[PDB]
Each structure stands twice: as C-alpha cells, then as structure tokens.
Amino acid sequence: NIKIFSGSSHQDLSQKIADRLGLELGKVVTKKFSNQETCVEIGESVRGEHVYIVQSGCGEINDNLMELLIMINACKIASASRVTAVIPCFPYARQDKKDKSRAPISAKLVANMLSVAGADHIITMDLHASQIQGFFDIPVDNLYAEPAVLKWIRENISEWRNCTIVSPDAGGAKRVTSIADRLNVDFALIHKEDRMVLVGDVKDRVAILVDDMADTCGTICHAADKLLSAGATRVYAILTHGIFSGPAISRINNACFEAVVVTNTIPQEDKMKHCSKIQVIDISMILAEAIRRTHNGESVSYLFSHVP
Amino acid sequence: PNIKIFSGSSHQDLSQKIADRLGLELGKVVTKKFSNQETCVEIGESVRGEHVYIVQSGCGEINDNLMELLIMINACKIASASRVTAVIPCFPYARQDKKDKSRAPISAKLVANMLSVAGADHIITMDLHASQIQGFFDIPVDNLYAEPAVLKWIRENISEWRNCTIVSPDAGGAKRVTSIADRLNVDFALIHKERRMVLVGDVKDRVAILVDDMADTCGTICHAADKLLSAGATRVYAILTHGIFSGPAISRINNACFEAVVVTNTIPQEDKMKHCSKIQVIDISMILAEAIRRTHNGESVSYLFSHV
Amino acid sequence: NIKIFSGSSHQDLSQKIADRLGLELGKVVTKKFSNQETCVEIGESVRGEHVYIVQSGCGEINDNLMELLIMINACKIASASRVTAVIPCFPYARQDKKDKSRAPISAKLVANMLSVAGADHIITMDLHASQIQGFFDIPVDNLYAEPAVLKWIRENISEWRNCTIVSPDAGGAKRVTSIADRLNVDFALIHKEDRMVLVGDVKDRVAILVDDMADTCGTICHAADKLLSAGATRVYAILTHGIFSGPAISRINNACFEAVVVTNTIPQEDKMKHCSKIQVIDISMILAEAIRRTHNGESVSYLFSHVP
Amino acid sequence: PNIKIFSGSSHQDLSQKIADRLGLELGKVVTKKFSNQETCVEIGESVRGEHVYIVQSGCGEINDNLMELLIMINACKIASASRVTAVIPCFPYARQDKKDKSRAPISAKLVANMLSVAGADHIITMDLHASQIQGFFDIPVDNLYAEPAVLKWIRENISEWRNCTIVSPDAGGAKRVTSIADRLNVDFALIHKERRMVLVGDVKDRVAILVDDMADTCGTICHAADKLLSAGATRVYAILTHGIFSGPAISRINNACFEAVVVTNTIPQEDKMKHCSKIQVIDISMILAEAIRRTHNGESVSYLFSHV
Amino acid sequence: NIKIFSGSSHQDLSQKIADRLGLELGKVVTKKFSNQETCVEIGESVRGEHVYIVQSGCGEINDNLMELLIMINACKIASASRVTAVIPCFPYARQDKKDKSRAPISAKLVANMLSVAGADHIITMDLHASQIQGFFDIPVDNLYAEPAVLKWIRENISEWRNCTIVSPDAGGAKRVTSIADRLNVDFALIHKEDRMVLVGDVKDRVAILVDDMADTCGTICHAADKLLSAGATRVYAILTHGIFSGPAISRINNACFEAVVVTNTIPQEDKMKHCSKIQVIDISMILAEAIRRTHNGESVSYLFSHVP
Amino acid sequence: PNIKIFSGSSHQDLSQKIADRLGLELGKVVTKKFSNQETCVEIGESVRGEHVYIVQSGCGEINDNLMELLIMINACKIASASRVTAVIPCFPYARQDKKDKSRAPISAKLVANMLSVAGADHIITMDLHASQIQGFFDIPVDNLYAEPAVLKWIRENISEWRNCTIVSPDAGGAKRVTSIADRLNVDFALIHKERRMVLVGDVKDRVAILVDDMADTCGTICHAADKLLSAGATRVYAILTHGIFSGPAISRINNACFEAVVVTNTIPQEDKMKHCSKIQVIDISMILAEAIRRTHNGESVSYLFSHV
Ligand SMILES: [Mg+2]
Ligand SMILES: [Mg+2]
Ligand SMILES: [Mg+2]
Ligand SMILES: [Mg+2]
Ligand SMILES: [Mg+2]
Ligand SMILES: [Mg+2]
Structure with missing residues (x-):
C-alpha cells in the first residue's frame, strides 16, 4: 500500500505522522562521509508501492535537500510506483523572483531538481508565495x-x-x-x-x-x-x-x-x-490527513478551512 | 548581426513604433482568418538563420492573440530561424498565476509552457502581474518596468x-x-x-x-x-x-x-x-525598442529597470 | 471511477455522451472576462480519478481550444490520475503540412499544446489526415x-x-x-x-x-x-x-x-x-462507447468496422 | 563559417558527389562492424565547434544504415560539434507513417524521435512519403522536391x-x-x-x-x-x-x-x-549540395522547390 | 493482466519464459521487406495491459533492436498501460565509454532510443558495466x-x-x-x-x-x-x-x-x-521469476543471491 | 569571442590560477549564506550573450558546493548567458555511480541530471571515477586526465x-x-x-x-x-x-x-x-586552463589526454 520514509535523523515529525497513520517508518540505511557526502540505501522493497518521503528538519538545508533528492531517486529506480515528497517547509522559497537583480530563482531550481529526481507529487505547507506551485508541472498540495x-x-x-x-x-x-x-x-x-x-x-x-x-x-x-x-x-x-x-x-x-x-x-x-x-x-495531523486522503483519492480541500 | 521584427495581428501601432526606433521595417506576414476564426499565418519572407522578434498584437481578443503569437513563433522555428524572442507587453492570463485555495488552473504557467513548446527562446515583457511568473519559464525572461x-x-x-x-x-x-x-x-x-x-x-x-x-x-x-x-x-x-x-x-x-x-x-x-x-x-515603445536593441547587442537591459 | 466534463456552454454532445454512460457531467464554474479571457474552476474533486473532457462546439475555435487546455491543466494539477481529451473535431487539422510555403504546422503545435497541458490520451473522430496521430507521443484513438x-x-x-x-x-x-x-x-x-x-x-x-x-x-x-x-x-x-x-x-x-x-x-x-x-x-454512441471501452481496458477496434 | 561533411557507410557516391560541389573533402570516419553486425564508428578528426552534415548511406540494409546514422550523429554531438544536420535523401520507414486501422507502429515517428534524441538539429530530405512527416519533428526539416x-x-x-x-x-x-x-x-x-x-x-x-x-x-x-x-x-x-x-x-x-x-x-x-x-x-546531388550550401549560408532553399 | 510478446522469430527463450508463467506468447503479425525494413502489427489488444516484450536472438543486432523498438512503440500507442523491455543481452553494451577516443557512447544512445520508444522498465541480465543502469531514468533490473x-x-x-x-x-x-x-x-x-x-x-x-x-x-x-x-x-x-x-x-x-x-x-x-x-x-526461470515478481510488486532482490 | 570565468565559493585558488593563465579576472559574484546555510548568489555583472565558465569551489562541504554550483549555473542561464560550462575538477557523488546489488541511489546520475536541468551546456572535469559517467549526460563532457x-x-x-x-x-x-x-x-x-x-x-x-x-x-x-x-x-x-x-x-x-x-x-x-x-x-590548473582556452576556440582538447 503506502510507505513512509523520513529524510534523516529527524524522525520527529515523520514519526508523529506515521503514528497517526497506523504505520512504522520504512527502513533506511544512511552513511555520511566527512564531506557530508550523503549515502542512502532503502532498507526494504518499495517495488510497486506509493512512497511518501518526509524531508528532515536536521538543520543544514543543503544536506537535507540532497538527502531528500537522493531518497526520491533511490525509490524511483527501485520501481516505486509513485513517490510523493512531503516538504513541510519548502527550501529556498524566499528565492522565488529576480527582484531587479541578476539573481537565481532558486525555488524554481529546487522545483526542477525535485522533478528530475523523480517526484510525482509534492505536499507542502504555506508556500512563501503560492506562485511556487506554478514552478512545477506535477501536482502540488499547499496546505494552510x-x-x-x-x-x-x-x-x-x-x-x-x-x-x-x-x-x-x-x-x-x-x-x-x-x-x-x-x-x-x-x-x-x-x-x-531604516x-x-x-x-x-x-x-x-x-x-x-x-x-x-x-x-x-x-x-x-x-x-x-x-x-x-x-x-x-x-x-x-x-x-x-x-x-x-x-x-x-x-x-x-x-x-x-x-x-x-x-x-x-x-x-x-x-x-x-x-x-x-x-x-x-502540532501540524502532524494535517499532514497525516493530507497523505491519507491523497492516497485514497479523497478530498483534501476540507483541510484548507478546517483542522482535522 | 541582423534581426527581423514581426507584428502579431493588425495592431501594428506598438510594433511599427518599435521597428521605427530600430530603423527596421516590420517583416512580411500574410494573415487570413478562416471560418471559426481559425488563425492562418504565413511568413512572407525567409527567416532562415535570423534572430526574430515577434511583438504580440493588441487585437483585444486574448485567445486569438495568443494563438496567433504561438503560431507565428512556431512558423519561424520550423523555418529555421536561429532564435525567436516573444515580445509580450501584457502577459496573457497573468492574473491566473495561483490556485488560491481552489481547483483552479494556473493558466499563466500553461501559457509559459505553450510559448516554450511553441519554440520561444526568450521573452520580453512589461510589469508581470507577479514577478514569480518569470519562474514559470525555463528560458530567459526580461521583465521591464x-x-x-x-x-x-x-x-x-x-x-x-x-x-x-x-x-x-x-x-x-x-x-x-x-x-x-x-x-x-x-x-x-x-x-x-x-x-x-x-x-x-x-x-x-x-x-x-x-x-x-x-x-x-x-x-x-x-x-x-x-x-x-x-x-x-x-x-x-x-x-x-x-x-x-x-x-x-x-x-x-x-x-x-x-x-x-x-x-x-x-x-x-x-x-x-x-x-x-x-x-x-x-508611450512605452521606446523602452521596448531599447530592450530589444540591447538584448540583441549584449548590453545591460537592467539599467532600463530604474531609468527611462 | 470516471468523470466527464464538458468544454463549455455546449453540453449538447457531452450531455448525450454522459447520458449514454449513465453519468452526470461534472460541475465546472466558468467566468469569462471581456477579452474572452477564460476562467475555469473544477467544481468537484477529481483527485485519483480518470477524467474525460469533451471539447465544446461553442464556435470560436481559439476560445474552445484554450478552454479545453485550461480544464486539462486544472484537472492535472488537481491530481487527476489521468486526463483524456475527447475532441470530436480536431482543431487546425487542415494545417498539418508546409505545402511548399513558410507555413506553421499548426496541428502539430496543437498536439504539443495538448501534451504540455497534461493530456494522457486523445479520442477524436476522422482526423483530416491520419498522420496527425504521429503528431503526438501519447496514445490517440481516431474513430471512424x-x-x-x-x-x-x-x-x-x-x-x-x-x-x-x-x-x-x-x-x-x-x-x-x-x-x-x-x-x-x-x-x-x-x-x-479554375x-x-x-x-x-x-x-x-x-x-x-x-x-x-x-x-x-x-x-x-x-x-x-x-x-x-x-x-x-x-x-x-x-x-x-x-x-x-x-x-x-x-x-x-x-x-x-x-x-x-x-x-x-x-x-x-x-x-x-x-x-x-x-x-x-448522431455519433454520441460511438464516442460514449470508446470512452466506456477505453476506461475498461476493452477493445475499441470493434468500432472501426461496426456501429454500436 | 566552416562546415564538415561526413558520409554514412561506404556508399560514398552521393556523399562524394555532394562534397565535390561544395569544394570539400568528406570528413575522416573509422568504421568497423563487429560480430552481429554491431556497428562501430569513430570520428577520425575533431568536430568541436563545427557545423556537421552527415549524409545517410546507401548500404541497402535499412536498420544498419539507420543505426550507423544515429551513432554518427551521437558521436558528433558528444564531441562538441556545435550543430548536426542529418541529410537523408530517402527517409527510412516513411511508409510506416499511420496506423491505418491497425495496432500498427507509426515507425516514421519513432525514427524522427530517434534522430532527435540522437542529437540532430536539422533534417534535410527529399520527397517525404507524406508531408505530414515534417510534423513528426520538433526540429526544422527541409523537404526537397x-x-x-x-x-x-x-x-x-x-x-x-x-x-x-x-x-x-x-x-x-x-x-x-x-x-x-x-x-x-x-x-x-x-x-x-x-x-x-x-x-x-x-x-x-x-x-x-x-x-x-x-x-x-x-x-x-x-x-x-x-x-x-x-x-x-x-x-x-x-x-x-x-x-x-x-x-x-x-x-x-x-x-x-x-x-x-x-x-x-x-x-x-x-x-x-x-x-x-x-x-x-x-542525379540529385546538385540539389542536395545546393540545399546544404544555402542552408549553411542563410539563403532561401525554398527556391529549389520549384526550380532545378 | 500481463502479456508477453517475443521480439521475433526467436521464440525460443520467450516461449520458455511464457511457459514458466502459465501463458501463451501474444499474437504478432510480422512482415519484412527486402531492405529488412521491419513491419509489425500487434495481433491482439493490449489496451490497459502490462506488456513485456522479450528481445529476439535472431542474430542481426540492428534488426533485433529496431524490431524491439517498433513493438514497444506499437504497444504504447495502442494504449498499453505499461511496457517493459526484457533484454537478456543488452545491445552495444561494450560501447559505454569514450576511452580517449572520439567515440559514440552507443549504449547511452540505445538507452535513449528505448526510452523515446516508450519503455517504462527494463529487465536485463549482467550489464557489461553496471553503470549502464545510469544511462536510463526509468527503472532497470539488472539480474545476475x-x-x-x-x-x-x-x-x-x-x-x-x-x-x-x-x-x-x-x-x-x-x-x-x-x-x-x-x-x-x-x-x-x-x-x-601483444x-x-x-x-x-x-x-x-x-x-x-x-x-x-x-x-x-x-x-x-x-x-x-x-x-x-x-x-x-x-x-x-x-x-x-x-x-x-x-x-x-x-x-x-x-x-x-x-x-x-x-x-x-x-x-x-x-x-x-x-x-x-x-x-x-538455462536462465529462463530467473527471467520468468523477475517478470512474475515485478508484475506482482514482489521483491526481486532474492534472485541476486539465489537461483529460483 | 569573449568569455567570463566565475569561481564557486571562496576557494579561489584553482579558479584564480586558471583565470591568470587565461589573462582574465574572475567575474564579480556576490555571495551571502543565510541561516540554515541557505546559499545566496548574485552575479555582480552582466553575462548577457556571454560564454560563461563556472569553476566549482573547494569549500569541502559537498552539498553546499553542489548547490552553489547549481545556483550559479541557474543565475547565469536566466541572465541570458549564451552558454554555460561547468568546470568541476572533482565530480561530486562520482563513487555513487551504480546500485551494486542494493536499493541504492545512482547519485552521480542524479547530479548529472541536476546540472543539466540547472542549465549547464557542457562539462569539463578530471578523472571521472568511472568513464561511463560521461554517459550520464546528454550534453558534451570533457574528461581530462x-x-x-x-x-x-x-x-x-x-x-x-x-x-x-x-x-x-x-x-x-x-x-x-x-x-x-x-x-x-x-x-x-x-x-x-x-x-x-x-x-x-x-x-x-x-x-x-x-x-x-x-x-x-x-x-x-x-x-x-x-x-x-x-x-x-x-x-x-x-x-x-x-x-x-x-x-x-x-x-x-x-x-x-x-x-x-x-x-x-x-x-x-x-x-x-x-x-x-x-x-x-x-598543479593541474594549467591543464584546466588549457582545456578551457581550447574548448572556447574549437581546438583539439584531446591532445591534452596524452600530454601535459
Ligand atoms: Mg499516492
Ligand atoms: Mg537575438
Ligand atoms: Mg482512463
Ligand atoms: Mg549549419
Ligand atoms: Mg508491470
Ligand atoms: Mg564556450
């Protein structure tokens, strides 16, 4: 059916979510070199399954991002039928326009990386600018x-x-x-x-x-x-x-x-x-509920005006 | 090198103003509207190996204007233009740039995608409804002020x-x-x-x-x-x-x-x-002329952002 | 299961089709500005569902096309599991070759727009040239x-x-x-x-x-x-x-x-x-039958030599 | 600027005729066939930064010819050729350009896709079986008569x-x-x-x-x-x-x-x-020579459509 | 459910595999012209089905490859829900690096062709270099x-x-x-x-x-x-x-x-x-087993250290 | 024509060595790190119409280095650089280039994909862990020795x-x-x-x-x-x-x-x-300088493979 994995050592929100869903977090074998070069190995089969990966709150944003991207990739080439990224706080979200500068639009780059990594769906909370949904071509659910x-x-x-x-x-x-x-x-x-x-x-x-x-x-x-x-x-x-x-x-x-x-x-x-x-x-219930509804083809609109 | 500038529709005022400031005549395009207002376009001259600028029309009817623009971009691309820039003073469907808590389309992203797939290599526009719309493209966009x-x-x-x-x-x-x-x-x-x-x-x-x-x-x-x-x-x-x-x-x-x-x-x-x-x-024709000239020549269009 | 929506104010063929399938047309909230800028909002969830959108016969071909593209887009980013465009008369079909002119191949552009909008399948009737199936990479069923x-x-x-x-x-x-x-x-x-x-x-x-x-x-x-x-x-x-x-x-x-x-x-x-x-x-039965069979993984070949 | 012209196979008659009319020698390509007729190709000179034309062979065996063409296009692309044009007098699988009421492949579209993914930037061909085949590409195609x-x-x-x-x-x-x-x-x-x-x-x-x-x-x-x-x-x-x-x-x-x-x-x-x-x-070598010359130089190849 | 087709006249391994699965090979109508131009027509519906195509061992590698690509294409545009290529010996696998030459990386080109043809999954045995899995973005199972x-x-x-x-x-x-x-x-x-x-x-x-x-x-x-x-x-x-x-x-x-x-x-x-x-x-059991497990969302890891 | 060379991070030793050998100053890039080590980059000068080379940093932290590189490539692309080459002496995640009988990511392919989607047109690198990694790209890669x-x-x-x-x-x-x-x-x-x-x-x-x-x-x-x-x-x-x-x-x-x-x-x-x-x-700065110079000028970088 559904498989939940946690981005990294922060299981804290992912564990709350899996609990609320009646699930244990899937097994992941992690090894980090000195350069913080991230190693991942999915510890169980995900073949044919709908996978949700919840990004860590470990702190180092570039580490968390790469780790997420790597797990998405690992799940996809392990024949996961679908992979949904659960990203409560969307990285680089404040970098979403040029603002009269020669600036990257890094939230777009992030959306592009998530896409090429193999994400089929994004679930996030309060995008800094809701236009960021348009940065993707895959479905995004932006919870409030x-x-x-x-x-x-x-x-x-x-x-x-x-x-x-x-x-x-x-x-x-x-x-x-x-x-x-x-x-x-x-x-x-x-x-x-000033x-x-x-x-x-x-x-x-x-x-x-x-x-x-x-x-x-x-x-x-x-x-x-x-x-x-x-x-x-x-x-x-x-x-x-x-x-x-x-x-x-x-x-x-x-x-x-x-x-x-x-x-x-x-x-x-x-x-x-x-x-x-x-x-x-605590917003774990909302996230847990969105995952539950998404998987079940149920409606998520409910959650925009109401707390589960 | 040389460029060619074409106008969408028979709004030629902006287009003709622009081409004047650049010392160019507007390219020859033959345009008949069929039956259901099905748009016919035919490039009246070779654009092979040329840097083309198509200035979107002002014929009011937004879907007619948008299809005519897409069809021109396409006609030029398959005619081996080396580069095609769409100049779109007023970006269509720009207000439709987020879901806003509805099962709504993000039509401005659809439009960016359609321009991209039509073969546009670059976009020049003025006062995007939201700056994040630049992020809807993977190609360069210059958003004039x-x-x-x-x-x-x-x-x-x-x-x-x-x-x-x-x-x-x-x-x-x-x-x-x-x-x-x-x-x-x-x-x-x-x-x-x-x-x-x-x-x-x-x-x-x-x-x-x-x-x-x-x-x-x-x-x-x-x-x-x-x-x-x-x-x-x-x-x-x-x-x-x-x-x-x-x-x-x-x-x-x-x-x-x-x-x-x-x-x-x-x-x-x-x-x-x-x-x-x-x-x-x-009159903003001078800004657009100047953005086109500078774009083509590799100079800083950014200065235009603060000055006139 | 299956959800049928109609392109626009023409429910006439779409209503015939939905009837034959034992279904009501899904709810769509439409608003049109002056510039004919099309607004759409899908009035019910389509999350997880196989959606069919039947293009209107409202007349204005560019309006009908954009409307269709917009509904396809809205359904896709609303997490429709699949979206099939039912396009009885394929727009710009007569513009499918250059014919020794600097002409767009606009039927290809149309196929490209439908693809980038998010269509997974096309069902049409009597393509003006059957080569137009090749204009897509997604499956096309061209009914006779x-x-x-x-x-x-x-x-x-x-x-x-x-x-x-x-x-x-x-x-x-x-x-x-x-x-x-x-x-x-x-x-x-x-x-x-002559x-x-x-x-x-x-x-x-x-x-x-x-x-x-x-x-x-x-x-x-x-x-x-x-x-x-x-x-x-x-x-x-x-x-x-x-x-x-x-x-x-x-x-x-x-x-x-x-x-x-x-x-x-x-x-x-x-x-x-x-x-x-x-x-x-009346060809509603044929279209209704193709939709029915497609959804059910049944054979559609039947319909090429026989009337349901 | 300079161009380079290579020949597929050891049919070099057309290729050599063409290169003569252009005042060029055919590029050096080293070609061994392994075991299962697995095709080996090696570009015998640098093509870095050059506009390459590969003239498809006439070695009869259509799948060998097509793979050799694809492999050459590929070898040139990853060798940093700035542009690669495939010159294919007789487009392979052109007869397979529609389903015609069968569960048939549209192989000419497969071929267009393979050339495109091989890295072809432009196609020159003669008398496409159907003109719609140009529509099978997103890259420019010139269809000579x-x-x-x-x-x-x-x-x-x-x-x-x-x-x-x-x-x-x-x-x-x-x-x-x-x-x-x-x-x-x-x-x-x-x-x-x-x-x-x-x-x-x-x-x-x-x-x-x-x-x-x-x-x-x-x-x-x-x-x-x-x-x-x-x-x-x-x-x-x-x-x-x-x-x-x-x-x-x-x-x-x-x-x-x-x-x-x-x-x-x-x-x-x-x-x-x-x-x-x-x-x-x-003899059509002159037409192809002239199309290549003109293509490279930005002149109207269209005139060739009506004249010799 | 599942449908197995054989690349060509070699049913020999494909027949062994289908037997072990309790299946008959699907019907395919083949016609070969002189130029060895491959014709295919899938002899039964594959609409909605998970299709496996087992490449032939007919000998002529370019013929076998094109045939496979063509059947993949035919199945995809016939609305197969999924198409898996079973390629026991991966063609051009020894051409997987440049090796200080201006050489194609033809195994990458082959991966690209299989992808554009419409393959969703590859099952192979002993890739000459396991890096070849990285030549794809779709899942590859490389059996040992x-x-x-x-x-x-x-x-x-x-x-x-x-x-x-x-x-x-x-x-x-x-x-x-x-x-x-x-x-x-x-x-x-x-x-x-030496x-x-x-x-x-x-x-x-x-x-x-x-x-x-x-x-x-x-x-x-x-x-x-x-x-x-x-x-x-x-x-x-x-x-x-x-x-x-x-x-x-x-x-x-x-x-x-x-x-x-x-x-x-x-x-x-x-x-x-x-x-x-x-x-x-005989490795038919291993291949048959991988197909069986894949289809069933079962684990295939088993087969890497154990013989079925 | 002219080129511009930028350095990743504040490792500027290699970068500055390289720019010296080429008679160039390093481009102006403004770099602040926010909070979570979220990377900020701003191109301090116009790169419009220029061939840019970004030399990856040596700031040790591999995910920070990789994001900074991606963000620079992106910033240049949307600033209308005509071409962007990534110079990456030590390719990150190169050891993660196969599954090796595990549910492991092929992270080097993820990285190639991310560079590609970031907008890199060309890669220059030294001693790829495996040569097949060049195959992970569709863009040209030069692998120096x-x-x-x-x-x-x-x-x-x-x-x-x-x-x-x-x-x-x-x-x-x-x-x-x-x-x-x-x-x-x-x-x-x-x-x-x-x-x-x-x-x-x-x-x-x-x-x-x-x-x-x-x-x-x-x-x-x-x-x-x-x-x-x-x-x-x-x-x-x-x-x-x-x-x-x-x-x-x-x-x-x-x-x-x-x-x-x-x-x-x-x-x-x-x-x-x-x-x-x-x-x-x-010191390998001379090789990289020489590869960049030659790359830009269309000469044979291959000679460097055997000589110093
Ligand atoms: Mg799911
Ligand atoms: Mg230009
Ligand atoms: Mg369906
Ligand atoms: Mg050229
Ligand atoms: Mg399957
Ligand atoms: Mg350069």
Missing part, C-alpha cells in the same frame, strides 16, 4: 496553517474579537486581511522604508503579527515595539515556519512579545528549552 | 506631488505602491474590500494616486476613488500600466472622480481615449 | 464515422448498390475507394485545376460526395453541378464534420443536393433551422 | 509529352500526379486495386507516365503498366523518386512494357542499371 | 547470472573448493573476486599488454575463466593456454553471454578448454551442434 | 622507476594501474580485501607505487601500504588524483610508511600539507 492559527487565536486570546491582525511587511497583506476577515476584525500593515511605518488601527487592541516564517526575527521584534509605541495592548507573533537562526532566540527573549507561536514544520524542542515565549502548534 | 516612466509623469503633472499619497486599490497591490511611495518619498495607503471598503493610511487633504498594474472593468479602482474622496483626498488620479479597459469600461472612469487616468500603450488606447478625456498614455 | 456512413447509405439510398462514391478533391481518394470497395460500387474523383475535372463513372448513377469536413462548401456545391453535368441522377454530400461557416448554409440551400449529411461532431441544430437539406447522424 | 527535375526530364525525353497522361499506380498517389499533370498542363488518371485493377481517367492513344514517390518490388507499378496498355496507352514510362528496387526487382521491369524507368540517385542505382537497360537516373 | 554460475561450479567441478577464478582482463577483477570470495577460493587476473601477463595463483589448481560475454573468443582461448603454461590443472570458461561470432566456434574446438559454459541469454542450439565443449545454463 | 602529469612525476622523482611496480589498492582499480604500468613499461599488482588483504603480482625488492583516482579516509590505501611492505616492497608511494583526505585523514599518512603521497589540486591541499610533510601536489 490558517485553520490551526485561527483556532489557536480563538482559544488563547480572550480579546480576539477586538484584536488587529498585523502584517510585518508589505507583501503579507493578503494573508492578514484574509485572517482579519475570517475573525471579523481589523488588520494593519508594517512597512520598512524606519518602520504602520498603517491601520492597533490602539488599545491586542496586536497579532502573522507571517509565514520567521528567521532571524529582526523584523518581527522591531514590529512589536512599533506596535506597542502605537498603542497596542500586547503583541503576539504567529509564524507558520519557525527558522529562528542566528540571534533569533536571543532577539525573542529580549523582545516584548506575550508569546511567539509556530508550527512544528521545523522542530522546536531544542529552541524552546532556551526560549519560553515559544509555543508550538 | 513602467515604474520609472510613472515616477517621471507623477513629478511632471502633479504639483502637490511632494506631499501626496500612493494608494493601492487592494491588499495585493501593497508592494507596488510602497515601492513608488518610497521613491517619491511620500505616504502610502491601502484599500481592502471586506469579505464595504476599508482604507488604512492617511489621505486627508492630500492628492491620492491610485496605482495598479492593470485595470479591467475598473469596478475596483472606481470604488476606491469614491472612498478616497469620502476619506478627504484632494484629487484622485489612477495609474495603471496595463489598461485593459473593458465592459463598464470608460463609462465608469467618466462618471468617476479621477482628475486623470494614466496608462501605457502596452495595450492600444486610441479608441478608448475617444470616449474618455481624462485618459492619458505614457 | 465510416461504419455509420455506410449504414446511412444502405438505409437512405435505394440505389446504393449502383451508386458512385465521389471524392471532391485529389487527396480524398483513399477514403472514397475504401467506401466504394465496402459497398462494392464505383468511385470517382473531382480535381480543381476548372474542375472529373475522372470516373457517374452517368445515370446516384453520386455520393464523401469527405471528412465541409466548411464554406464552395467546393462541394461546385462538385455537385459537375456531377450532374456529367450525368449523375442525383447527388448527396456526406461530410463527417459540418463546419458550414460563411455562406455555406446559403450555398447549400441554393445547391442541387438531394441531401447533405453530417455527424454531430459539431452542433447542427441552429444550422438545420435555416437549411432543410441537412440531416444529422 | 524531385518534381522540377522530373518535369524537366519529361519535357526533354517524351516527344508526345504535350498530350500525355500522368498516372498514379494507386489511390494515395492522386495528389502527386495531379500536381505534375497540372504543371505539364496534361491529363491525369488513377489506378486502384479493388479490395483486379480499375483505371479512371483517359489514356487511350496517348503516352502514359506512371509517377510514384517510391517503388520497392515494383509489383504494383508493373501491374499498372499492363492495365495501362490494356487501356490503350501508346507507351508507358514509370517515374519514381526513390528507387528501392528489391526482390522481384529489376526482373519485373525488364519483363514489363516500360519504355523507360526513371529514378533519382537518392538510393544507389549503379548495380541495378547493370541488369536493366530501361532504367535511367536523374 | 552469478547464483546460477556458483551452482554450476559447485555441481560440475569436483575441485571447486581449491580452484582459482580468473579474469581474462583487467576490468573483470571485481566480478571474479566476488565469485572467489563467495566460493572462498583464489582469484587471478590476465592482462593483455603479450598476456598473469597475476595470481593457478598452479596445480583448476582454473575457471569467468567473464560477462565471449564474442570472437580470441582472448579466452589465449588465456586458457597461459593458464595451462602457468600450471593450472585444467581450464573452464564461463561466460554469461555467448556471442560466439566469427571463428569463435573454431577457436573453441581447437582450444584446450575442458568446457565452455554460457547461459541461454543468446540461443546456443545451432552453435552446440558444431561445438561439444559448450554447455548451457 | 592526470595520467600524463603522474607519469611525468613518477619518472622525475622515483630513481628506481624503471623496475618499479604500480599497485592498485583494490580490485576495481585494475584498469587504472595497468594503463600506467604499461606506459612506464613496468609490473603491476593488485590488492583485495577478502570479504585480510591479498596481493597478486610481485613487489619484492622493488619500489611500489599505489595509484588510485581518489582517497578519502585513506584507510584502504594505508592498509595496502603495510601489506606492500610485508610483501617486501622497497619503498611505497601513494598517488591519488583526488585528495579528499578527511577524518583519520593526514593522521594515517604520517603514521604510515609512504615515502611520499602525491595528489593534484583538484581539491585544495594547502591546509592538509601543513600537517603532512610527505604530501606533494601536482
């Missing part, structure tokens, strides 16, 4: 964390009915307006010009900074100040993907957030030990 | 421009307007139709310039104008790079409060201007 | 109207046993000789040189002009005269595809045909109201 | 040519013969083997010229000749562009009533002519 | 004769426990060392410098020359002498593929072999009548 | 070289060492780790030169050296073209009996040499 975020908001913020959803940048409006309209509240936008400007009403309201991902957190931390200076009562930040590299964890601990909420598309345990503002939404 | 021309026109036609506001008609236009606002060094603001219009940012007692990449039926831009007046804007202008202007069309602009409505001639505006005094056109 | 034509002939023409099958042009010999041999009668050929020449025996025989398609009908009408001048008793014309654009319907009403017979690969109702010489063979 | 040469030979060798008939041996040859007949301004007629031969059109007391694109065993052309005499033709000639001439071969032509049998040297005829006085050859 | 060879050795050579496995060339070490280690014996290597040198211990031991294929047998015959001159007690040669072209059969009959063992990947009956040193290992 | 340089160094540094033995550390290195041994006109021998080391061929009282294409942890080469001494070799040298030298690394070489250990600078050796007196480097 929105239902889970709206639920977390209604359950953890007393004042959600009078709050303002804030975008930390110009290109995040659509996302926050969509959330503001669902909750039926206000929205506001920050724009960095000075931030705020448009929209946050005074004496709870402010919720919503974004797809936080990396170094320079931006969100500064946005929280700005929001407080403009009269917000308190500030939350909710990111789908919690990268938190560099001084993020330090920037967060010193920042005036009530809480910083992220999904577990990227593993957060280590990060949480050193940062108590962080709360995690 | 009207921005410099617009900035120039704003400074040379709006006296109170130094304290004006640049306004986006919707949430998704944020990035466009903030880039302009930042360059003029003025304020920006955004409108959102709640799913009544809401305006965030200030416009009271200042000229408001609605800026958008394209306007079709103008229902959105014309509402925004009212709200902008309701909000206390002195005068409201509307600036679109692509003036599709159909249906309720020029009706709405007249019965609307725009001081002026500026567009480029990426789409033919001659007829529309007859029934609309408040419409003005920035 | 011949069995249905031979049946109509045996049942509507008393004198069929002593009739002559006439080709209106040089490149139609094979088709008519094949029909003449099946019926065991004579065949004859018209060739336009004068028509007839070779073959039609004197005191019923003459049946057989062709794949009639468009403006200039040719067939003139052939009927010629046949009568050469002594044919009466003349019928039988075309698989009844385009009948331009002055066809006028040319037919003034022409000396006993009857003009066409299939419903193209809708004929409107055309018949204004032309009483026209009779229609 | 023997027609002008044939027309010239007919006028210069048949005294009663002004009142002669051009006759097709079968139904599918109609278009070929009517094009010739129309240019000579004479009569045409067609033969059909009923599925006994039937002749339509007149030939009594006039010279009849059987014209075909190719003759293999000559069973069809030789029967047609009898019937043509039975019908009262004065003298019968046979004119084929491709003289495959195998098996019953030249036997049949001798014991047949042909005044003459004309062919081109797209296939080597030297040996065949030994055992056949009535055979004559139009 | 090793288990069958080790079994033949243990059962036919009393002294196998004290024998030496010898490679006839430098590039055969891995193969023989692998066999020597399994049997737990010595290995030795011949290297041609003089052969032997490294390794063969004195007073039985010597077993093991290789993937023998063609003209010049090398193996000379190696046997060398081995005897160095003190081997007697010499066997075991090749997976017995080509035995040219003077092989004469070279073998005059050579000092105890026996020459080959599989029936290539038919040996005729060859054996004229050479009594030859013994044949 | 260190052999001439090694042969030169052996003759100029080993006094007793005329009666020395060339030794392979394993069974698969046979062909490499016999080619060298044959050219020096000396003895060869081979080592095999029984699956204890076995040595076949003689080395007693003669200098033994271990030759390999690459050494990683040196466990194999360092054991072989012991056995070589145990066997009675006078002095043992080790010669690898690719000195990866990781982990137990230079430790082992020091505590091993090598007179010297020679490597090329396909990989940076500066740091390694600090902790290893017995290491020496043959």
